[PDB]
Amino acid sequence: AFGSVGEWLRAIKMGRYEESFAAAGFGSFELVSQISAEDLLRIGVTLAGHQKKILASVQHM
Ligand SMILES: [Cl-]
């Protein structure tokens, strides 16, 4: 378990997206667990490799 979405993003080397997750309203794991590729694109994860890494990480929840 992570203490916050930030801690999670940081842990999976995706800390660069912290502010953009938070501003888009993804501040709980309940929301992030339902995240899709379209969501990731909307908030600014433009790289498919980062999208894949993020989505593979959430598929654990
Ligand atoms: Cl934090």
DSSP code per residue over 13-55 = T-GGGHHHHHHTT--SHHHHTT--HHHHHHHT---HHHHHHHH
Amino acid (1-letter code) at residue 36: S
DSSP classification of residue 59:
T
Q: What is the CATH number of domain 1-61?
A: 1.10.150.50
Rounded to the nearest angstrom, the distance between the alpha carbon of 52 and the centre of ligand 1 is 23
- Cβ proximity of 5 and 58 under 8 Å: no
Please name the method used to determine this structure: X-ray
Residues in the chain: 61
- In this structure, the number of other CB atoms found within 10 A of the CB of residue 44 comes to 14
**Which one, of 10, 12, 23, 7, lies nearest residue 52 by Cα?**
12
Q: Give the distance (Å) from ligand 1 centre to CA of residue 36.
A: 22
56 phi and psi angles, rounded to 5 deg: -70, -35
Q: Which residues surround ligand 1, an ion (CB under 5 A)?
A: 4, 6
Give residue 4 CA to ligand 1 midpoint distance, Å: 6
**Domain residue spans in the chain?**
1-61
